[PDB]
Amino acid sequence: GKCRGLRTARKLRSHRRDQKWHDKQYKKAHLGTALKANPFGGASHAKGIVLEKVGVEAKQPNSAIRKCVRVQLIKNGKKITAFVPNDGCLNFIEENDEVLVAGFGRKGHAVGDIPGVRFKVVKVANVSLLALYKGKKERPR
Amino acid sequence: MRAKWRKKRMRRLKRKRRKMRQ
Amino acid sequence: TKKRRNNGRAKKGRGHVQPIRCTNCARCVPKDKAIKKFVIRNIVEAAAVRDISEASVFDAYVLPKLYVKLHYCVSCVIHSKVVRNRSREARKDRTPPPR
Amino acid sequence: GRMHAPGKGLSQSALPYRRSVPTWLKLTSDDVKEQIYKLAKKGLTPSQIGVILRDSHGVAQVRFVTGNKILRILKSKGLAPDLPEDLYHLIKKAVAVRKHLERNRKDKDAKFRLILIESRIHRLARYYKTKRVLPPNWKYESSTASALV
Amino acid sequence: VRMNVLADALKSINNAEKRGKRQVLIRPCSKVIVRFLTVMMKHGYIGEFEIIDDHRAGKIVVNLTGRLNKCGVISPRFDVQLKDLEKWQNNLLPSRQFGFIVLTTSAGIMDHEEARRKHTGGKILGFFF
Amino acid sequence: FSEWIDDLEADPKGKFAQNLLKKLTG
RNA sequence: CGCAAGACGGACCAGAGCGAAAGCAUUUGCCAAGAAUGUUUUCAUUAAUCAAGAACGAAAGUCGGAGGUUCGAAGACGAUCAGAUACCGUCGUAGUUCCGACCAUAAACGAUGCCGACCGGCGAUGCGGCGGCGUUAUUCCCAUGACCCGCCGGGCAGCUUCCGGGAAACCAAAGUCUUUGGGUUCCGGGGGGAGUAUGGUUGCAAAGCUGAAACUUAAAGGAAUUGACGGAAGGGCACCACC
RNA sequence: ACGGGGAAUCAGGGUUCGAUUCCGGAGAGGGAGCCUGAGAAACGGCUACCACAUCCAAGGAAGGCAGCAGGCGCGCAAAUUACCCACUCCCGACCCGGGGAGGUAGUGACGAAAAAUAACAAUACAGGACUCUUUCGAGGCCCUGUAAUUGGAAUGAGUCCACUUUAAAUCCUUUAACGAGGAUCCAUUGGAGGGCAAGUCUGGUGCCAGCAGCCGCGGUAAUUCCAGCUCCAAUAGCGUAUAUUAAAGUUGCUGCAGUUAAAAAGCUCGUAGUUGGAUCUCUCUCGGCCGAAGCGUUUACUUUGAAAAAA
């Protein structure tokens, strides 16, 4: 059992502090390896340059080709795969253009069928993918 | 796989690595 | 999950029980876990008893018996039908079969 | 339970409610003191003295006839041993175990029991040192122990 | 070994009350145990009890009236100020209409209501309801 | 009314299963 | 019919005993321990659990020495098989044995830390103690042995129970837990990566202790239920089964 | 990782944040050394070196925006090279001068507060019911909705005067003029299988395109893609990513677990650590109905009092 003594404050606090390191979220948020291995470097978004268009095959139960792009981040030169969300939206992207990329919503985790893809394209050429999708804006010339 | 044979494979790997790094 | 409260043995109050060799397969089985049979059988069969008693030079010689101790392992004891599987409730029963 | 054994024995003396000298006992307090002095001069420890006072002289409890405990009586008269009886007996047992172990060096059980006995010796010595019965410099050694016995 | 003889006493009372027994034997007794039992009695939770005097430490035969739901000890004896008394009441008592937290204060051993009346904190010994 | 009850009993674990079970009462 | 060697102590042998655990079974002697019981003996809080540290620690394995019966990793053959680098068989090295020095690991298990209190019943059994009809032995008296009937104290367990608990299996503890606090140590935080890499430490080695991260993943898993299946057992039926 | 006051969250306990206007510290590209002075190891002072960099007639000279604006660069990420000493205060020799301190405007969907996008009548229409016979029907006697029906009333968004504001100003407030029937002066952002409120309606596609935080939807009748219609959620706002808090009694002090789900060290001993059985119910002096110097062994605890920056 646990120690219940008026002078056990140090032991209880030390035990709590050591046992917190066995929590995956606490260890992730307090070690620095996750922060240093995060391609965004702790940011919410990052700008990158599209290196090529790729088609990632959905996981085994489903069957589709998710259109993604290989982008190299300007901040650190790291290469990542960013999903191009909507349909026909890969047509809005051209090679070697600047894209603003956010996370996929699961904090470094793959989302849905797309295996190993944790980023999604938010902007291409300083215009949001949603504005191009609905015809609100057109690609800069 | 039987866990003890996985342990045996790991130990043989460690011996091979020890031979690697003398 | 636990099938038996005694773990299929009688090792209560000790740490180690000396092993014995199965009479059938020679497998090493703890002496308290092995299934023990004591067979006291007439040294001549019930068929040969008539000829042997008729040919005896004595009158009422009474043939000697044969006292054999068999220590089956669980696999061999189950295969030889010396013991068999029982229902979860009937497993707890410890009275020997009436025979 | 036991300090160094898994036993949980309950056997012990059960003292009666009354704290008075029994009716059968005609011995006065000074007579009991003189008997205690003679027994101590004979070379008997307070446990032994109480045993033979209870067993042959009808003295159920010396404290209820004299008003003092046997060890205190011996200290007051001045013929009490240098070190206490229980510690002396523990040291004697440890010396005996060590003497056995020198001629029987493969007895791991003897080594385990000697460790237990020496732990008991150290606990008793620490207690007696806090109570100032033993000098603060008193220490138990593996060589001078037989001298104290 | 045995520590907190009050804990053992209250555990014995609780286990006897769960079993429906009319009496419980508490041993060893103590001043704290007797004061706690008296505080229990003035509120009508246990009724009369008797102290058997053996010449080493007392025993107590407590008659049990089946009015007791839970008697418990709070170990360690946390020091409680008047401000924290409401939090302790919320934590330990089933309702604000009944149930008492027993504290040892410099004015003696008493329930939390009497501690508020005397305007004193103390160390929490236990609770009963 | 009983339409949801009846279409549920046709396919208890079909596509229209959570919908109909919720539509019964929620 | 003998002789020699080494190994091992059958049956008795038990849900019996002892030991901290590992473990412990021919006789006799010596040696030092030990629990429990008994105690109107003694001390008088001397205690519980414990970082550090220390003793012991199956088997296998590692160094030297002795021995070397059996069995036997490896190995050599012979079989079986589509193939067998296995299962089976004949040999057979290390080892298995003892001595000294290492190693410190096991499903080292009750998969259940230790100390303390309370909470049902019953019949057994081991040790000690107490009481008592009666039987039997020491030729006859008490004592004492062997039984018989009870009681008490610790112990290995068992059965039973709507104590209570629990996801249940089950557990008189795994109960006295939202009516949550007796004391204390160790230790877990979804599954893998992985007890891995790395550093440190220990070891002659084999390895032991400490011990991640990147990455990956929606489940792994526990108990129980219904089916289906089984080269599992037991029953029953049928000339599309047999006699 | 500047610290604190403090902030977010929070049943109780807690968890996280605090560069950031107030207090304290530190620094002025990095180091170091000084002058002056009451006060500086000052940098909108000097002296060097190190890095970077400006002008040069090549001999030399001159640097320090982590002040206010404004550039570059970096990035997901942050505004004007504006006006004024009128306020608040500060400095000076000074009622008078000066202050990018500070104030005022500009940009501003960081956030927070209030708050429009219609209201009311008649007309019939889908209309109900304590209106009534007898359920059948009359339905201006008690209220919604078809509205490309009708009708006048109201008003501010806007434009524009005059004040007022203020150091000129702007804004708000006030006054007048014009200003509303698709009142086209036209509300959006996400969704409609479950979680989770709202369609197994229609067309298209056909494991494709895609959707989908999760479970899953899609392979010719898709309640889930792409659309149209309709519907609901919040609303001048709403979605997304990341971080964080509650949810998490999934860090458990309150308050978790450890037979089999993850887990008690193989086993004892043992120091520190933690924990530890009963017991014990106010006196010498001074100015005659007072006043006290105290050592009663202290500590924890509890209660009171003092002191404790505002925000």
d(CA E48, CA E29): 15
Q: Does A2 touch chain E (CB under 8 A)?
A: no
3-state secondary structure of C87: coil
Do D33 and D46 fall within a single domain? yes
Do D30 and D61 fall within a single domain? yes
Q: How many CA atoms lie within 13 A of A131 on its CB side?
A: 12
For chain A, give every domain's residue range: 1-141
Do D131 and D146 fall within a single domain? yes
The verdict on residue D49 lying in a domain is: yes
3-state secondary structure of D47: helix
Q: Determine, for residues E77 and A4 on separate chains, whether the beta-carbon distance falls below 8 Å.
A: no
d(CA E122, CA E107): 9
- HEC string of chain E equals CCCCHHHHHHHHHHHHHHCCCCEEEECCCCHHHHHHHHHHHHCCCCCCEEEECCCCCCEEEEECCCCCCCEEECCCCCEECCCCHHHHHHHHCCCCCCCEEEEEECCEEEEHHHHHHHCCCEEEEEEEC
Q: Does E55 touch chain D (CB under 8 A)?
A: yes
Nearest nt to the CA of E90 via C1' is H12
The kind and range of the H/E element at F7 are helix F2-10
| Chain D: closest CA distance from residue E52 (Å) | 12
3-state secondary structure of A47: strand
Amino acid at D41: K
Chains A and E touch (3+ CB pairs under 8 A): yes
Contacts of E46 (CB under 8 A, 6+ apart): E13, E37, E40, E62, E63, E64, E65, E67, E68
In this complex, which residue's CA is closest to the C1' atom of nucleotide H225?
A: A87
d(CA A51, CA A71): 5
| Chain A: closest CA distance from residue E43 (Å) | 30
d(CA C37, CA C44): 20
Method in brief: cryo-EM
Do D86 and D147 fall within a single domain? yes
- What's the total number of domains in chain D? 2
Q: Which nucleotides of H are covered by protein (CB under 7 A)?
A: 11-13, 74-77, 190, 193-195, 197, 200, 207-219, 223-226, 240-244, 250-260, 264, 268-271, 273-280, 301-304
Range of the domain at D31: 26-80
CA A72 to chain centre: 13
d(CA A29, CA A35): 8
The verdict on residue D118 lying in a domain is: yes
The kind and range of the H/E element at A81 are strand A79-83
Amino acid at C53: S
CATH number at residue D112: 1.10.287.10
d(CA A101, CA A27): 26
Q: Where are the beta strands (DSSP E) in C15-99?
A: 19-21, 28-30, 35-42, 65-72
F-contacting chains (≥3 CB pairs under 8 Å): none
Q: How far apart are the first and last CA of chain D?
A: 29
The verdict on residue D138 lying in a domain is: yes
Cis preceding-peptide flag for E76 (omega within 30 of 0):
yes
For residue D135, what are its two tokens? 């000098």
The C1' atom of G148 and the CA atom of C96 lie apart, in whole Å, by 28
Amino acid at D122: H
Among D62, D80, D98, the domain boundary falls at D80
Q: Are A81 and A56 in contact (CB under 8 A)?
A: yes
Output DSSP code: residue A101. E
For residue A19, what are its two tokens? 């046992």
Chain E partners within 8 Å of D19 (Cβ) = 55
Do D74 and D124 fall within a single domain? no
Which region, left, alpha or beta, applies to residue C67 given φ > 0 means left and ψ of -120 to 50 means alpha? beta
d(CA D115, CA D128): 20
3-state secondary structure of C9: coil
Which residue, A95, A94, A99, A91, is CA-closest to A128? A99
Nearest nt to the CA of A4 via C1' is G181
Q: Determine, for residues A4 and E76 on separate chains, whether the beta-carbon distance falls below 8 Å.
A: yes
Which residue, D86, D85, D114, is CA-closest to D98? D114
d(CA A69, CA A95): 9
Q: Is the CB of D109 under 7 A from strand G?
A: yes
Cis preceding-peptide flag for A39 (omega within 30 of 0):
no
Amino acid at D123: R
Q: Are C17 and C30 in contact (CB under 8 A)?
A: yes
3-state secondary structure of D122: helix
Got the DSSP string for C58-76?
SSS----EEEEEEEE-HHH
Q: Are D126 and D140 in contact (CB under 8 A)?
A: no
Output DSSP code: residue D123. H
Nearest C-alpha in D relative to E54: D17
- HEC string of D96-119 equals HHHHHHHHCCCCHHHHHHHHHHHH
Is the Cα torsion angle A114, A116, A120, A125 positive or negative in sign?
negative
Do D70 and D87 fall within a single domain? no
Output DSSP code: residue A122. E
Place of tokens 């039908």: C81
Output DSSP code: residue C13. S
The verdict on residue D7 lying in a domain is: no
The C1' atom of H283 and the CA atom of E61 lie apart, in whole Å, by 46
Place of tokens 């009993």: F9
Backbone angles phi, psi at F7, to 5 degrees: -70, -25
Task: Work out the number of other CB atoms within 10 angstroms of the CB of residue A87.
Answer: 9
Do D44 and D65 fall within a single domain? yes
Angle at A48 between CA A44 and CA A49, to 5 degrees: 165
Contacts of E108 (CB under 8 A, 6+ apart): E35
Q: In what order do the strands lie in the sheet with E49-52?
A: E23-26, E59-63, E49-52
Q: Determine, for residues E54 and D17 on separate chains, whether the beta-carbon distance falls below 8 Å.
A: yes
Any bridge partners for residue E62, and if so which?
E24, E49
Do D86 and D48 fall within a single domain? no
3-state secondary structure of C17: coil
Backbone angles phi, psi at E80, to 5 degrees: -120, 125
The verdict on residue D19 lying in a domain is: no
Q: Are C23 and C72 in contact (CB under 8 A)?
A: yes
Please give the interface size between A and E, counted as residue pairs whose CB atoms are below 8 Å apart.
6
Do D111 and D121 fall within a single domain? yes
For residue A117, what are its two tokens? 């893809």
3-state secondary structure of A83: strand
Angle at D147 between CA D143 and CA D148, to 5 degrees: 110
Among D36, D64, D80, the domain boundary falls at D80
3-state secondary structure of A10: helix
Any bridge partners for residue A56, and if so which?
A66
Do D89 and D141 fall within a single domain? yes
| Buried/exposed D6-33: b ≥16 CB within 10 Å, e otherwise | eeeeeeeeeeeeeeebeeebebeeeebb
Chain D partners within 8 Å of E55 (Cβ) = 15, 17, 19
Do D133 and D148 fall within a single domain? yes
Cβ burial of C53 (10 Å; 0-12, 13-18, 19+) is: middle
Chain D partners within 8 Å of E54 (Cβ) = 17
| Chain E: closest CA distance from residue A13 (Å) | 17
Do D76 and D89 fall within a single domain? no
- CA gyration radius, chain A: 21
Amino acid at A54: V
Nearest C-alpha in E relative to A4: E76
d(CA A71, CA A78): 8
Which residue, D127, D142, D47, is CA-closest to D97? D142
| Chain A: closest CA distance from residue E80 (Å) | 13
For residue D131, what are its two tokens? 């109570």
All structural domains of chain E, each given as residue ranges with its CATH number in brackets, are: 1-68 (3.30.1370.30), 69-129 (3.30.1490.10)
